[PDB]
Amino acid sequence: GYDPATGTFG
């Protein structure tokens, strides 16, 4: 779920 690339959650 967590977006590591952008550092968000989607």
Side-chain angles (χ1 to χ4, degrees):
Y2 180 83
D3 208 20
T6 288
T8 333
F9 270 89

